[PDB]
Amino acid sequence: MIVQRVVLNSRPGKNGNPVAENFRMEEVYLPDNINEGQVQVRTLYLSVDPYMRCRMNEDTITPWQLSQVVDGGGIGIIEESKHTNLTKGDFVTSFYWPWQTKVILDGNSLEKVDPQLVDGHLSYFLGAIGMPGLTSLIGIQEKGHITAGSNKTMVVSGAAGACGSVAGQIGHFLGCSRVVGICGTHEKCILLTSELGFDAAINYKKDNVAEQLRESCPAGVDVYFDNVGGNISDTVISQMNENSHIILCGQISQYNKDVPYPPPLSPAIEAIQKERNITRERFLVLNYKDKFEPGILQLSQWFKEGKLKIKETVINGLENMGAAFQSMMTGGNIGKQIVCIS
Ligand SMILES: NC(=O)c1ccc[n+]([C@@H]2O[C@H](COP(=O)([O-])OP(=O)(O)OC[C@H]3O[C@@H](n4cnc5c(N)ncnc54)[C@H](OP(=O)(O)O)[C@@H]3O)[C@@H](O)[C@H]2O)c1
Ligand SMILES: COc1ccc2c(c1)c(CC(=O)O)c(C)n2C(=O)c1ccc(Cl)cc1
């Protein structure tokens, strides 16, 4: 059998912008034999995620290698098994799925998923009922310091993306009385306020952010779910209250620069931080793998109850992996960027 796969073609440079050309699609034969403890899976969906930007650089786990197959989050279906708890027809996922239409994997690296949790919408396991959703829920639970009925105001940057779109709804579910998002287009702002329940949405590219935050957050900001960093965050931090908390989820505005992570705050912003006693600690969802079960069950519950709205942008075809990554990195996605493989 002949399958398609995607390999890393070129590096954009630690200070470069990633582009679709950094990837190349090829055709290869799929081995006709599977060893023991190994399974053959048909790839259904693949995720593209901002952390991948660092895997394209020569340094920072392992980076992708030129000419070798790329990998990342994926969901598929078992076609042939030689591993105990894995059977033809089982739906599985892995953080290291090769960007290839069909692949042979060691069952040990796979994890069975229950279609019932997502009402059969398997791509949701790569988003809101998956890692980004877990990141938002656990991040707010572990670093948000909210309380049922606090009347707190939360600001969310990267508000219309995978983590941000879920974080804002979760802020309201857990007690925030006001949730304001910051995103890059008016189309996203209207989606946030009209469908996801945000109280206000600011377009950082065209609106006066500072002024708009003053209007929409009349009582300051108690919680900042930060996905972008940079100048947007400085503006947000400026309007934050005493003893507030920044959930440091990501700093995507810095991912195409040669800087340390987490980026440090500018002198004046850091002074404000410390003076107001604002907490800003590193947060890595992988450090809470024991809350993954209850997180996923809670996220599923809220979705089944009609409370949690799940937005995704699906692109079709493996040949489009590089275009999807490039698109997500530049704001073309609303909600979770997904690639449908078959
Ligand atoms: N701490 C953890 O364990 C953890 C886990 C998963 C993800 N993350 C982090 O969370 C963030 C969001 O991840 P995601 O998967 O949900 O991706 P996403 O938000 O769905 O997609 C990226 C979005 O970032 C925005 N963006 C790109 N460049 C930007 C810039 N220079 N300035 C401002 N906004 C920019 C774009 O939308 P706009 O149109 O609004 O600009 C884009 O759609 C990333 O920073 C990621 O590294 C952290
Ligand atoms: C350089 O920075 C990285 C590298 C991998 C990361 C992350 C950040 C973040 C944090 C972020 O996006 O800032 C998350 C959540 N990662 C994973 O879940 C993950 C996915 C697949 C494999 Cl294999 C191993 C880890």
PDB file of N, CA, C and O in Angstrom, residues 201-240:
ATOM      1  N   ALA A 201     -15.689  41.933  23.636  1.00  0.00           N
ATOM      2  CA  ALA A 201     -14.570  41.429  22.856  1.00  0.00           C
ATOM      3  C   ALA A 201     -13.903  42.614  22.161  1.00  0.00           C
ATOM      4  O   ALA A 201     -14.569  43.443  21.509  1.00  0.00           O
ATOM      5  N   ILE A 202     -12.583  42.688  22.316  1.00  0.00           N
ATOM      6  CA  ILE A 202     -11.780  43.760  21.759  1.00  0.00           C
ATOM      7  C   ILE A 202     -10.857  43.228  20.641  1.00  0.00           C
ATOM      8  O   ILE A 202     -10.193  42.188  20.815  1.00  0.00           O
ATOM      9  N   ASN A 203     -10.802  43.952  19.522  1.00  0.00           N
ATOM     10  CA  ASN A 203      -9.955  43.581  18.383  1.00  0.00           C
ATOM     11  C   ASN A 203      -8.630  44.379  18.583  1.00  0.00           C
ATOM     12  O   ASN A 203      -8.597  45.610  18.412  1.00  0.00           O
ATOM     13  N   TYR A 204      -7.550  43.697  19.004  1.00  0.00           N
ATOM     14  CA  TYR A 204      -6.295  44.412  19.268  1.00  0.00           C
ATOM     15  C   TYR A 204      -5.691  45.051  18.037  1.00  0.00           C
ATOM     16  O   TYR A 204      -4.896  45.965  18.180  1.00  0.00           O
ATOM     17  N   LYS A 205      -6.082  44.614  16.847  1.00  0.00           N
ATOM     18  CA  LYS A 205      -5.534  45.203  15.633  1.00  0.00           C
ATOM     19  C   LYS A 205      -6.181  46.545  15.220  1.00  0.00           C
ATOM     20  O   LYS A 205      -5.537  47.371  14.528  1.00  0.00           O
ATOM     21  N   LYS A 206      -7.431  46.770  15.614  1.00  0.00           N
ATOM     22  CA  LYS A 206      -8.098  48.006  15.201  1.00  0.00           C
ATOM     23  C   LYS A 206      -8.689  48.862  16.318  1.00  0.00           C
ATOM     24  O   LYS A 206      -8.921  50.041  16.119  1.00  0.00           O
ATOM     25  N   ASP A 207      -8.957  48.284  17.487  1.00  0.00           N
ATOM     26  CA  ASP A 207      -9.541  49.052  18.577  1.00  0.00           C
ATOM     27  C   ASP A 207      -8.423  49.642  19.450  1.00  0.00           C
ATOM     28  O   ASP A 207      -7.247  49.195  19.364  1.00  0.00           O
ATOM     29  N   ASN A 208      -8.804  50.642  20.275  1.00  0.00           N
ATOM     30  CA  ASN A 208      -7.911  51.291  21.250  1.00  0.00           C
ATOM     31  C   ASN A 208      -8.076  50.307  22.390  1.00  0.00           C
ATOM     32  O   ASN A 208      -9.091  50.352  23.105  1.00  0.00           O
ATOM     33  N   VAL A 209      -7.100  49.406  22.567  1.00  0.00           N
ATOM     34  CA  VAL A 209      -7.252  48.367  23.583  1.00  0.00           C
ATOM     35  C   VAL A 209      -7.403  48.891  24.993  1.00  0.00           C
ATOM     36  O   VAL A 209      -8.321  48.481  25.677  1.00  0.00           O
ATOM     37  N   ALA A 210      -6.493  49.773  25.419  1.00  0.00           N
ATOM     38  CA  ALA A 210      -6.502  50.344  26.757  1.00  0.00           C
ATOM     39  C   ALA A 210      -7.853  50.979  27.127  1.00  0.00           C
ATOM     40  O   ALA A 210      -8.441  50.728  28.201  1.00  0.00           O
ATOM     41  N   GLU A 211      -8.333  51.810  26.210  1.00  0.00           N
ATOM     42  CA  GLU A 211      -9.573  52.516  26.409  1.00  0.00           C
ATOM     43  C   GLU A 211     -10.724  51.522  26.518  1.00  0.00           C
ATOM     44  O   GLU A 211     -11.534  51.606  27.459  1.00  0.00           O
ATOM     45  N   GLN A 212     -10.776  50.569  25.580  1.00  0.00           N
ATOM     46  CA  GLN A 212     -11.842  49.555  25.578  1.00  0.00           C
ATOM     47  C   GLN A 212     -11.831  48.705  26.839  1.00  0.00           C
ATOM     48  O   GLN A 212     -12.882  48.291  27.315  1.00  0.00           O
ATOM     49  N   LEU A 213     -10.645  48.399  27.359  1.00  0.00           N
ATOM     50  CA  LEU A 213     -10.554  47.622  28.601  1.00  0.00           C
ATOM     51  C   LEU A 213     -11.099  48.449  29.795  1.00  0.00           C
ATOM     52  O   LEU A 213     -11.649  47.898  30.752  1.00  0.00           O
ATOM     53  N   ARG A 214     -10.928  49.770  29.716  1.00  0.00           N
ATOM     54  CA  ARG A 214     -11.428  50.692  30.749  1.00  0.00           C
ATOM     55  C   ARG A 214     -12.965  50.658  30.772  1.00  0.00           C
ATOM     56  O   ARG A 214     -13.585  50.562  31.832  1.00  0.00           O
ATOM     57  N   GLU A 215     -13.559  50.720  29.592  1.00  0.00           N
ATOM     58  CA  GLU A 215     -15.002  50.679  29.459  1.00  0.00           C
ATOM     59  C   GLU A 215     -15.591  49.352  29.884  1.00  0.00           C
ATOM     60  O   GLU A 215     -16.519  49.299  30.696  1.00  0.00           O
ATOM     61  N   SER A 216     -15.023  48.265  29.349  1.00  0.00           N
ATOM     62  CA  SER A 216     -15.564  46.933  29.620  1.00  0.00           C
ATOM     63  C   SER A 216     -15.158  46.291  30.930  1.00  0.00           C
ATOM     64  O   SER A 216     -15.757  45.304  31.344  1.00  0.00           O
ATOM     65  N   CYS A 217     -14.144  46.826  31.595  1.00  0.00           N
ATOM     66  CA  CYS A 217     -13.720  46.247  32.870  1.00  0.00           C
ATOM     67  C   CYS A 217     -13.700  47.435  33.825  1.00  0.00           C
ATOM     68  O   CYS A 217     -12.657  47.849  34.309  1.00  0.00           O
ATOM     69  N   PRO A 218     -14.885  47.995  34.119  1.00  0.00           N
ATOM     70  CA  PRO A 218     -14.958  49.158  35.020  1.00  0.00           C
ATOM     71  C   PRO A 218     -14.369  48.981  36.403  1.00  0.00           C
ATOM     72  O   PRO A 218     -13.987  49.949  37.049  1.00  0.00           O
ATOM     73  N   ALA A 219     -14.259  47.753  36.854  1.00  0.00           N
ATOM     74  CA  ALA A 219     -13.711  47.504  38.175  1.00  0.00           C
ATOM     75  C   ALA A 219     -12.332  46.835  38.138  1.00  0.00           C
ATOM     76  O   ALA A 219     -11.946  46.125  39.080  1.00  0.00           O
ATOM     77  N   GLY A 220     -11.599  47.051  37.054  1.00  0.00           N
ATOM     78  CA  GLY A 220     -10.277  46.467  36.946  1.00  0.00           C
ATOM     79  C   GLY A 220     -10.346  45.019  36.497  1.00  0.00           C
ATOM     80  O   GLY A 220     -11.413  44.548  36.105  1.00  0.00           O
ATOM     81  N   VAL A 221      -9.216  44.319  36.551  1.00  0.00           N
ATOM     82  CA  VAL A 221      -9.146  42.938  36.103  1.00  0.00           C
ATOM     83  C   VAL A 221      -8.566  42.090  37.224  1.00  0.00           C
ATOM     84  O   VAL A 221      -7.511  42.383  37.759  1.00  0.00           O
ATOM     85  N   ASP A 222      -9.283  41.021  37.555  1.00  0.00           N
ATOM     86  CA  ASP A 222      -8.916  40.121  38.629  1.00  0.00           C
ATOM     87  C   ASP A 222      -8.168  38.935  38.127  1.00  0.00           C
ATOM     88  O   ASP A 222      -7.289  38.418  38.805  1.00  0.00           O
ATOM     89  N   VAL A 223      -8.509  38.493  36.926  1.00  0.00           N
ATOM     90  CA  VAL A 223      -7.828  37.342  36.341  1.00  0.00           C
ATOM     91  C   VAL A 223      -7.488  37.528  34.861  1.00  0.00           C
ATOM     92  O   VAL A 223      -8.358  37.905  34.077  1.00  0.00           O
ATOM     93  N   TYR A 224      -6.243  37.211  34.480  1.00  0.00           N
ATOM     94  CA  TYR A 224      -5.808  37.352  33.102  1.00  0.00           C
ATOM     95  C   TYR A 224      -5.370  36.003  32.585  1.00  0.00           C
ATOM     96  O   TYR A 224      -4.373  35.479  33.053  1.00  0.00           O
ATOM     97  N   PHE A 225      -6.177  35.397  31.694  1.00  0.00           N
ATOM     98  CA  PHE A 225      -5.819  34.112  31.114  1.00  0.00           C
ATOM     99  C   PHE A 225      -5.035  34.589  29.873  1.00  0.00           C
ATOM    100  O   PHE A 225      -5.637  35.035  28.883  1.00  0.00           O
ATOM    101  N   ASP A 226      -3.698  34.490  29.955  1.00  0.00           N
ATOM    102  CA  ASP A 226      -2.760  34.979  28.930  1.00  0.00           C
ATOM    103  C   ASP A 226      -2.258  33.914  27.944  1.00  0.00           C
ATOM    104  O   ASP A 226      -1.570  32.977  28.322  1.00  0.00           O
ATOM    105  N   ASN A 227      -2.583  34.077  26.673  1.00  0.00           N
ATOM    106  CA  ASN A 227      -2.133  33.142  25.670  1.00  0.00           C
ATOM    107  C   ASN A 227      -1.098  33.795  24.720  1.00  0.00           C
ATOM    108  O   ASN A 227      -0.457  33.110  23.921  1.00  0.00           O
ATOM    109  N   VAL A 228      -0.976  35.126  24.799  1.00  0.00           N
ATOM    110  CA  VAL A 228      -0.151  35.854  23.812  1.00  0.00           C
ATOM    111  C   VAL A 228       1.055  36.655  24.267  1.00  0.00           C
ATOM    112  O   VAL A 228       1.987  36.833  23.498  1.00  0.00           O
ATOM    113  N   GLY A 229       1.027  37.191  25.479  1.00  0.00           N
ATOM    114  CA  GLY A 229       2.132  38.008  25.943  1.00  0.00           C
ATOM    115  C   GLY A 229       2.290  39.327  25.195  1.00  0.00           C
ATOM    116  O   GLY A 229       1.352  39.893  24.527  1.00  0.00           O
ATOM    117  N   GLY A 230       3.514  39.845  25.288  1.00  0.00           N
ATOM    118  CA  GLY A 230       3.827  41.068  24.548  1.00  0.00           C
ATOM    119  C   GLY A 230       3.067  42.306  24.909  1.00  0.00           C
ATOM    120  O   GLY A 230       2.615  42.431  26.007  1.00  0.00           O
ATOM    121  N   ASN A 231       2.900  43.221  23.952  1.00  0.00           N
ATOM    122  CA  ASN A 231       2.254  44.484  24.235  1.00  0.00           C
ATOM    123  C   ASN A 231       0.812  44.352  24.688  1.00  0.00           C
ATOM    124  O   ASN A 231       0.381  45.147  25.500  1.00  0.00           O
ATOM    125  N   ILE A 232       0.079  43.341  24.194  1.00  0.00           N
ATOM    126  CA  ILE A 232      -1.290  43.142  24.662  1.00  0.00           C
ATOM    127  C   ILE A 232      -1.249  42.862  26.159  1.00  0.00           C
ATOM    128  O   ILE A 232      -1.990  43.440  26.949  1.00  0.00           O
ATOM    129  N   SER A 233      -0.357  41.983  26.584  1.00  0.00           N
ATOM    130  CA  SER A 233      -0.328  41.681  28.014  1.00  0.00           C
ATOM    131  C   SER A 233       0.055  42.848  28.899  1.00  0.00           C
ATOM    132  O   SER A 233      -0.471  42.966  30.019  1.00  0.00           O
ATOM    133  N   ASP A 234       0.979  43.686  28.415  1.00  0.00           N
ATOM    134  CA  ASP A 234       1.388  44.876  29.165  1.00  0.00           C
ATOM    135  C   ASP A 234       0.156  45.768  29.410  1.00  0.00           C
ATOM    136  O   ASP A 234      -0.101  46.279  30.531  1.00  0.00           O
ATOM    137  N   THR A 235      -0.606  45.975  28.354  1.00  0.00           N
ATOM    138  CA  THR A 235      -1.819  46.768  28.481  1.00  0.00           C
ATOM    139  C   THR A 235      -2.740  46.100  29.498  1.00  0.00           C
ATOM    140  O   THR A 235      -3.263  46.758  30.400  1.00  0.00           O
ATOM    141  N   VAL A 236      -2.918  44.788  29.414  1.00  0.00           N
ATOM    142  CA  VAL A 236      -3.815  44.143  30.380  1.00  0.00           C
ATOM    143  C   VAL A 236      -3.294  44.277  31.831  1.00  0.00           C
ATOM    144  O   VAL A 236      -4.038  44.694  32.751  1.00  0.00           O
ATOM    145  N   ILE A 237      -2.015  43.969  32.025  1.00  0.00           N
ATOM    146  CA  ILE A 237      -1.435  44.023  33.353  1.00  0.00           C
ATOM    147  C   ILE A 237      -1.602  45.401  34.029  1.00  0.00           C
ATOM    148  O   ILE A 237      -1.828  45.494  35.260  1.00  0.00           O
ATOM    149  N   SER A 238      -1.538  46.452  33.209  1.00  0.00           N
ATOM    150  CA  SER A 238      -1.721  47.858  33.633  1.00  0.00           C
ATOM    151  C   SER A 238      -3.069  48.116  34.312  1.00  0.00           C
ATOM    152  O   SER A 238      -3.192  49.021  35.144  1.00  0.00           O
ATOM    153  N   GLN A 239      -4.087  47.350  33.925  1.00  0.00           N
ATOM    154  CA  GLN A 239      -5.403  47.558  34.485  1.00  0.00           C
ATOM    155  C   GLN A 239      -5.816  46.459  35.469  1.00  0.00           C
ATOM    156  O   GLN A 239      -7.011  46.283  35.780  1.00  0.00           O
ATOM    157  N   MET A 240      -4.826  45.719  35.952  1.00  0.00           N
ATOM    158  CA  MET A 240      -5.083  44.633  36.876  1.00  0.00           C
ATOM    159  C   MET A 240      -5.086  45.086  38.338  1.00  0.00           C
ATOM    160  O   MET A 240      -4.338  46.019  38.715  1.00  0.00           O
TER     161      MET A 240
END
